[PDB]
Amino acid sequence: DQLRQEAEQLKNQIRDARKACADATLSQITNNIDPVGRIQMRTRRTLRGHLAKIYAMHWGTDSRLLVSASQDGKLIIWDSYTTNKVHAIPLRSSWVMTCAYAPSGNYVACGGLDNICSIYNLKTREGNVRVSRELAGHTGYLSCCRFLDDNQIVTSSGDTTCALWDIETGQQTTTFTGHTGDVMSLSLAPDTRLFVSGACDASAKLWDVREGMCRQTFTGHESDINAICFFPNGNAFATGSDDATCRLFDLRADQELMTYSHDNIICGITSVSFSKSGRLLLAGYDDFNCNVWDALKADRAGVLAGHDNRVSCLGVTDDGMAVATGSWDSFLKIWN
Amino acid sequence: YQVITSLLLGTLIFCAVLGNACVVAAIALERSLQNVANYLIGSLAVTDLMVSVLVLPMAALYQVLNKWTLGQVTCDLFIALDVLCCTSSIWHLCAIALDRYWAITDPIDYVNKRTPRRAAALISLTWLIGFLISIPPMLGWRTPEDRSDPDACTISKDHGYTIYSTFGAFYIPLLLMLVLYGRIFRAARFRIRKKNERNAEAKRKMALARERKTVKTLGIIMGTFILCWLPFFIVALVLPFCESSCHMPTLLGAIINWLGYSNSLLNPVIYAYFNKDFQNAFKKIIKC
Amino acid sequence: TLSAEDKAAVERSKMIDRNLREDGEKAAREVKLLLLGAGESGKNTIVKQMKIIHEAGTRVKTTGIVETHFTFKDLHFKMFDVGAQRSERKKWIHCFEGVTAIIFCVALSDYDLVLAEDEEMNRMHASMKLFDSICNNKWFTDTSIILFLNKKDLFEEKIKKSPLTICYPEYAGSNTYEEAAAYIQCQFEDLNKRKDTKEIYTHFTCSTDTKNVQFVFDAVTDVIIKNNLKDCGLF
Amino acid sequence: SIAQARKLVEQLKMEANIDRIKVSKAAADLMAYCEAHAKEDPLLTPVPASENPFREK
Ligand SMILES: C/C=C\C/C=C\C/C=C/C/C=C/CCCC(=O)O[C@H](COC(=O)CCCCCCCCCCCCC)COP(=O)(O)O[C@H]1[C@H](O)[C@@H](O)[C@H](OP(=O)(O)O)[C@@H](O)[C@H]1O
Ligand SMILES: CC(C)CCC[C@@H](C)[C@H]1CC[C@H]2[C@@H]3CC=C4C[C@@H](O)CC[C@]4(C)[C@H]3CC[C@]12C
Ligand SMILES: CC(C)CCC[C@@H](C)[C@H]1CC[C@H]2[C@@H]3CC=C4C[C@@H](O)CC[C@]4(C)[C@H]3CC[C@]12C
Ligand SMILES: CC(C)CCC[C@@H](C)[C@H]1CC[C@H]2[C@@H]3CC=C4C[C@@H](O)CC[C@]4(C)[C@H]3CC[C@]12C
Ligand SMILES: CN1C[C@@H]2c3cc(Cl)ccc3Oc3ccccc3[C@@H]2C1
């Protein structure tokens, strides 16, 4: 039709406004800042017990317990301080691609090539875990899921849509539409009021939980985005992509600030996360290792080598003490 | 003179202990190399390591000095340990051939009923046969000629014991291996044998190439087992029975003896240093 | 360390770890097969042919992936159908690395028909595109492919009227079932670039006894035996 | 595919009519936060082993 002309001139308006707001790059302002200094983290724990590729992990809010998922259909809950297997949940489907651990500490979630999110009541009267709820309605594989609270959860799927659910009812309250590719990643805001999502259309978008509407769009990558993470402040986020580079976007400026790339990296990024103060950006790669970036400088501060296969999942402790990285070689390694 | 022989036998022992420790170490700390097949190869390396540290040094001394200087008791131990660890080595080569056989010819057993307990039982049986061959001479089966000369650490060389410890240690192991690998060869050759013309030509060339790989592999395994131990066990059966005018030239005795013991140096090379799974895991550990 | 709760935790960790080893051994005794093919290519006919009298040795419908358990001659098989996953393939195709073999189903009678997405796209040209895509992934270098050529009798009835030259312009020859089946089979097996590592086992789906399950059995045992000869160094 | 185009343009005019700020102020806010909390993060500066639960309890 002829609505494309108006759409194009609005694209040009956004572009011209973003350009007027550019006056000084982060890299010109953080120029008198003393560099971080080389980071020596050394693996403190190595958790064993999974017999297949790990795909996901999530720390607990108590900063001691953590849950992981594997293709052998097991959901193990660890005690990181003592390296003790506390629980081991057998899944109905072994094709699991994500997991989440409830902030209250009573529930866990799962999902994958089965288009269903399953929720398990860890804390019950008998000490035996049973499937509390199953959530259906997505048309594609469940890519990510995060507990909004003890009764609501946000999921993203390969049908190019996200959804918010009520666990007690079992039906999706809101649906977020607008992406044109598979939604691969998801990240809740620190206040759990907004959330961002990365997709296969090489764009990141911002959503409002209540209104169910897209507020902003971000196009800096030229290929698929595989991971995304909020800055601790809540006014910025980082995206990991197949471009062999990760970028930092700011909500109030509506544009990317930094580009972390190097000539020795040509693989893709599988996971990103931020330190407690936001100075460090930890990114996992297909090159079997995790590279530590200085968020304000875009220079390597350390490498977390030690995994035999691709690093698929990554997570930083809520108190910032230690960082855990899982991999395709079936070993979780806590670094600290 | 004795300087020369002491350094030539000295390097042989060094290369042997080094080669065998490396294999066990690779297995120990590599998760990839934790399969039933590589357990049996790893146990051969343990046994061959035990020979190279326990028997071989105490034997090199009896060669360079031309006398036994450790007393009658130590020598009884030397002989027992020589007939224990080396018999176990030759029966480990048959455990591997039976494992390979049960895998080419029985996929259902391979998928369903094959567990590391199989390797454990096979290794235990190997060591049990070694004990059953090496213990008899201690509790009987012994001649006074062994203890007659203090400067000698020979074997009982009783006729019945010669038959026993020569058939149960080489000649029965040999027959089993020649049968199993012949069956494996026939099974291999079958699976191999069974524009369009270019495709046909390409397939013909690939078949011939694979029929040259299998013949080369089988020729290496058997023609290293034969050329190591056969010269020795022929003489060790003939000499005791044919006593009159059968002088063994001293020089020939030692060459034959240490050609046999070189099997503990060549076994790691053929069973471990050729298959990529090991070779690539060595790359890994070398690079931190 | 020596506290009662610590000992209880260690014992529970031991109990869990034993159950997880027992589960891993039980699970290792299965043969996993990936089922692929076009939408209306006779996949359901194959699925039913496998589960005739031996099967499986408030839940919600999954709709994502379909499981089919069947035993045949003391061998337990797992077959995964991913035909209902209408999304980007390359995002989840790496999850199936390590399957024993791939079953690809083609309907021979699809050459006249065209896809509903666009008229200028033959259903069999999409089939070769899919076959070339899956056969040459970096994950499936050493995975053998079992190829099923479905609907032989409808294919035969058609080629008395419509020639095979409408599907393959460069083709030139007589029209009969044998010479068309052979030509199509040679066309699909030419798409194999990894000739040295992988092999294609082609079959024509019959409706007689369990000869289709016998073919899968004989092909999977051949794959296992050849893997063990390569590991031994004789292939 | 026409209603799609109308929905598309209706979103683009909501994302064009929003309050934007200067990139310098945002950068200043982020750096203020970074060196605001620069002591609270053990990954930035190694912690003594007495206070570290993952090395010695
Ligand atoms: C006249 C007509 C015809 C005859 C004439 C000519 C042709 C034939 C001649 C006779 C053959 C001699 C030896 C050939 C060896 C040879 O070709 O080796 C190949 C090349 O590797 C290297 O080069 C690398 C090997 C490195 C090994 C370690 C080296 C250092 C050891 C030091 C030990 C002491 C100090 C520690 C590797 O092996 P390969 O290509 O021969 O093929 C097979 C091998 O034979 C199987 O054993 C092996 O099974 P495994 O038992 O589990 O290992 C198979 O997986 C496979 O590798
Ligand atoms: C002084 C004597 C007793 C020992 C000399 C050193 C030993 C370790 C040397 C001498 C001859 C060597 C072999 C010569 C040739 C080959 C073929 C090659 O494809 C693999 C290694 C292999 C099989 C070598 C292994 C190491 C070897 C056995
Ligand atoms: C004596 C110790 C050191 C072993 C050294 C190898 C010796 C014995 C040599 C001499 C004769 C050789 C064989 C002669 C013939 C062939 C056929 C050929 O197509 C492949 C190699 C193969 C099978 C050779 C393997 C190595 C071999 C057995
Ligand atoms: C590993 C393979 C390649 C080695 C093959 C050669 C072996 C059998 C050779 C290398 C060095 C040799 C020894 C060198 C010195 C002497 C002293 C002499 O008075 C008797 C023979 C004796 C004891 C030799 C026995 C055979 C020997 C051990
Ligand atoms: C040089 N030694 C001699 C000794 C041996 C000698 C006789 Cl006559 C019979 C059995 C023997 O046990 C075995 C068995 C196998 C291989 C070596 C030996 C060792 C090797």
Q: Which residues contact A75 (CB under 8 A, 6 or more apart)?
A: A67, A68, A69, A87, A88, A89, A91, A96, A99, A108, A110, A120
CA distance D10 to C124: 42
CA distance A35 to B12: 56
Residue B157 is assigned to a ligand binding site:
no
Among C114, C137, C136, which Cα is nearest to C125's? Answer: C114
A323, D43 in Cβ contact below 8 A?
Answer: yes
For residues D10-36, b (16+ Cβ closer than 10 Å) or e, as one string? ebbeebbeeeeeebbebbebbbebbee
CA distance A94 to B131: 48
DSSP category for residue D46: P
Among A261, A197, A264, which Cα is nearest to A229's? Answer: A197
Structure tokens at C87: 């999304």
Structure tokens at C4: 């009662």
For residues C49-68, b (16+ Cβ closer than 10 Å) or e, as one string? bbeeeeeeeeeeebebbbeb
Structure tokens at A144: 């990510």
CA of B258 to the centre of ligand 3 (A): 19
A142, A155 in Cβ contact below 8 A?
Answer: yes
Which amino acid appears at position A52 of this protein?
A
Structure tokens at A108: 């866990």
C89 in catalytic set: no
In order of A278, A280, A282, B272, the CA distances from A235 in angstroms are 12, 16, 18, 58
**Residue D2, min C-alpha distance to chain A (Å):** 7
CA distance A321 to A277: 12
Atom of ligand 3 nearest to the CA of B212: 19
Domain interval for residue D13? 2-54
Q: Which residues contact A290 (CB under 8 A, 6 or more apart)?
A: A282, A283, A284, A303, A304, A305, A307, A311, A314, A325
CA distance B80 to B58: 13
Residue nearest to atom 3 of ligand 3 (CA): B224
Classify residue C24 as exposed, middle or buried by CB count within 10 Å of its CB (0-12, 13-18, 19+): middle
B165, B133 in Cβ contact below 8 A?
Answer: yes
Test C196 with B100 for CB contact under 8 angstroms: no
Q: Which long-range contacts (CB under 8 A, 24 or more apart) does C21-30 make?
A: C23/A72, C23/A74, C23/A90, C24/A51, C24/A72, C25/B115, C27/A72, C29/B111, C29/B112, C29/C76, C30/C76, C30/C77, C30/C78
Which method, experimentally, gave rise to this model?
Answer: cryo-EM
- DSSP line for A185-216: EEEE-TTSSEEEEEETTS-EEEEETTT--EEE
Instruction: For residue D17, give the CATH number of its domain.
Output: 4.10.260.10
A323, A334 in Cβ contact below 8 A?
Answer: yes
CB-nearest to D33 from A14, A233, A253 is A233
Q: For chain A, give me the number of helices (H) and strands (E)? A: 2, 28
Q: CA of C88: which chain A residue's CA is closest? A: A182
CA distance B239 to B234: 9
Structure tokens at A83: 């390296």
In order of C41, C42, C48, C189, C220, the CA distances from C213 in angstroms are 18, 15, 11, 22, 11
Among D43, C171, D34, C90, which Cα is nearest to A200's? Answer: C90
Q: Which residues contact B275 (CB under 8 A, 6 or more apart)?
A: C231, C233
Residues of D in contact with A275 (CB under 8 A): 41, 43-44
CA of B123 to the centre of ligand 2 (A): 27
DSSP category for residue B243: -
Among B217, B228, B223, B216, which Cα is nearest to B89's? Answer: B228
C190 in catalytic set: no
Structure tokens at B122: 């096979």
Q: Does D12 touch chain A (CB under 8 A)?
A: yes
Q: Count Cα neighbours of B282 within 13 Å in the Cβ-side half-sphere.
A: 13
CA distance B81 to B130: 10
Q: CA of C81: which chain A residue's CA is closest? A: A113
- Which chains does chain A touch, 3 or more C-beta pairs < 8 A? C, D
Which amino acid appears at position C7 of this protein?
K
Report phi then psi at A195, rounded to 5.
Answer: -160, 150
* Superfamily designation of domain A1-335: YVTN repeat-like/Quinoprotein amine dehydrogenase (2.130.10.10)
Test B275 with C233 for CB contact under 8 angstroms: yes
Classify residue B159 as exposed, middle or buried by CB count within 10 Å of its CB (0-12, 13-18, 19+): exposed
C125, C119 in Cβ contact below 8 A?
Answer: no
Q: Which residues contact C82 (CB under 8 A, 6 or more apart)?
A: A113, C34, C35, C36, C65
CB-nearest to C17 from A72, A85, A92 is A85
Region for A68 from its dihedrals, namely left if φ exceeds 0, alpha if ψ lies in -120 to 50, beta otherwise: beta
Terminal CA-CA length for chain D: 64
Structure tokens at B253: 């005795």
User: Quick check: CB of B217 below 6 Å from ligand 1?
Assistant: yes
Report phi then psi at A331, rounded to 5.
Answer: -130, 125
Which residue is it, tokens 């494992």? Answer: B99
CA of C67 to the centre of ligand 4 (A): 64
**Residue B226, min C-alpha distance to chain C (Å):** 20
What's the helix, strand, coil split of chain B in %, to 5?
80, 0, 20
Among B100, D42, B112, B180, which Cα is nearest to A275's? Answer: D42
Report phi then psi at A285, rounded to 5.
Answer: -135, 170
In order of B52, B79, B157, B248, C36, the CA distances from B255 in angstroms are 17, 19, 20, 12, 64
Terminal CA-CA length for chain C: 54
Positive or negative CA dihedral for C188, C190, C196, C197? Answer: negative
A21, D21 in Cβ contact below 8 A?
Answer: yes
Torsion of CA B266, B267, B268, B273, to 10 degrees: 80
Q: Does A168 touch chain D (CB under 8 A)?
A: no
DSSP category for residue D56: -
Positive or negative CA dihedral for B265, B267, B270, B276? Answer: negative
In order of A55, A321, D6, the CA distances from A335 in angstroms are 18, 9, 51
CA distance B243 to B230: 20
| CA geometry: angle C110, C116, C122, nearest 5 deg | 40
In order of B32, B33, B96, B116, C231, the CA distances from B36 in angstroms are 12, 9, 10, 5, 12
Which residue is it, tokens 């060094």? Answer: B14
- For helices B276-286 and B2-29, the axis angle rounded to 10 degrees is 90
User: Quick check: CB of B262 below 6 Å from ligand 5?
Assistant: no
CA of B254 to the centre of ligand 3 (A): 23
- For helices B263-271 and B71-104, the axis angle rounded to 10 degrees is 20
Q: Which residues contact D54 (CB under 8 A, 6 or more apart)?
A: A44, A45, A80, A81, A321, A322, A334, A336
Q: At B39, which helix (H) or strand (E)?
A: helix B36-64
Residue B11 is assigned to a ligand binding site:
no
Sheet of A311-316, strand order: A45-47, A332-334, A323-327, A311-316
Q: Which residues contact C223 (CB under 8 A, 6 or more apart)?
A: C100, C101, C144
Q: Check: CATH 1.20.1070.10 for B2-286?
A: yes
Alpha helix (H) residue ranges in A202-292: none
Residue B22 is assigned to a ligand binding site:
no
Q: Which residues contact D7 (CB under 8 A, 6 or more apart)?
A: none
A150, A107 in Cβ contact below 8 A?
Answer: yes
Residues of A engaging C, defined by a Cβ cutoff of 8 Å: 49, 51, 71-72, 74, 76, 79, 82, 84-88, 90, 92-93, 95, 97, 112-116, 134, 136, 139-141, 158-159, 181-182, 184, 200
Q: At A248, which helix (H) or strand (E)?
A: strand A246-250
3-state secondary structure of A290: strand
CA distance C120 to B114: 54
CA distance C52 to B73: 73
CB-nearest to A141 from C10, C60, C64 is C64
CA distance A89 to A193: 31
Domain count, chain D: 1
- For helices B172-193 and B71-104, the axis angle rounded to 10 degrees is 20
- DSSP line for B88-127: HHHHHHHHHHHHHHHHHS-HHHHHHT--HHHHHHHHHHHH
Residue B223 is assigned to a ligand binding site:
yes
Task: From the candidates C6, C22, C40, C97, give the one annotated as an active-site residue.
Answer: C40
Among A255, A250, A231, A228, which Cα is nearest to A239's? Answer: A228
Q: Which of B216, B255, B265, B274 to mutate to test the pocket of ligand 3 (most atoms within 8 A of CB)?
A: B216
Q: Does C170 touch chain B (CB under 8 A)?
A: no
C235, C113 in Cβ contact below 8 A?
Answer: no
Q: Which of A21, A47, A83, A201 to mutate to test the interface with D (most CBs of D within 10 A)?
A: A21
CB–CB contacts below 8 A, A to C: 83
Task: Kindly report the length of chain A.
Answer: 336
A334, A44 in Cβ contact below 8 A?
Answer: yes
Q: Does C31 touch chain B (CB under 8 A)?
A: yes
Query: In this structure, which ligand is nearest to the CA of B227?
Result: 3
Among B155, B149, B153, which Cα is nearest to B70's? Answer: B153
Structure tokens at D34: 């970074």
**Residue C149, min C-alpha distance to chain B (Å):** 20
Classify residue B168 as exposed, middle or buried by CB count within 10 Å of its CB (0-12, 13-18, 19+): middle
Question: Does chain A reach chain D with at least 3 CB pairs under 8 Å?
Answer: yes
C178 in catalytic set: no
C40 in catalytic set: yes
Q: At A284, which helix (H) or strand (E)?
A: strand A280-285
Residue B87 is assigned to a ligand binding site:
no
For residues C121-141, b (16+ Cβ closer than 10 Å) or e, as one string? ebbbbbbbebbeebbeeeebe
- For helices C152-159 and C177-190, the axis angle rounded to 10 degrees is 120
Residue B149 is assigned to a ligand binding site:
no
A333, A325 in Cβ contact below 8 A?
Answer: yes
Which residue is it, tokens 């002591």? Answer: D39
Which residue is it, tokens 């080489």? Answer: B170
CA distance B22 to B26: 6
C45 in catalytic set: yes
CA distance A175 to A213: 9
Q: Which of B2, B18, B229, B255 to mutate to test the pocket of ligand 4 (most atoms within 8 A of CB)?
A: B255
- Which chains does chain B touch, 3 or more C-beta pairs < 8 A? C
Q: Does A281 touch chain D (CB under 8 A)?
A: no
DSSP category for residue D51: G
Q: Count Cα neighbours of C196 within 13 Å in the Cβ-side half-sphere.
A: 6
A315, A273 in Cβ contact below 8 A?
Answer: yes
Among A221, A220, A240, which Cα is nearest to A229's? Answer: A240
B212, B241 in Cβ contact below 8 A?
Answer: no
3-state secondary structure of D25: helix
Question: Does chain B reach chain D with at least 3 CB pairs under 8 Å?
Answer: no
> Gap positions in chain C, given as the residue before each gap (C–N > 2.5 A)?
57
CB-nearest to D30 from A233, A321, A336 is A233
Task: Kindly report the length of chain B.
Answer: 288
CB–CB contacts below 8 A, A to D: 148
Beta bridge partners of A47: A332
CB-nearest to C234 from B107, B108, B213 is B213
3-state SS string for A80-125: CCCCEEEEEEECCCCCEEEEEECCCCCEEEEEECCCEEEEEECCCC
Which residue is it, tokens 């203890």? Answer: B147
3-state SS string for chain C: CCCHHHHHHHHHHHHHHHHHHHHHHHHHCEEEEEEEECCCCCHHHHHHHHCCCCCCCCCCCCCCCEEEEEECCCCEEEEEECCCCCCCHHHCHHHHCCCCEEEEEEEHHHCCCECCCCCCCEHHHHHHHHHHHHHCCCCCCCCEEEEEEECHHHHHHHHCCCCHHHCCCCCCCCCCHHHHHHHHHHHHHHCCCCCCCCCEEEEECCCCCCHHHHHHHHHHHHHHHHHHHHHHCCC
Which amino acid appears at position C168 of this protein?
Y
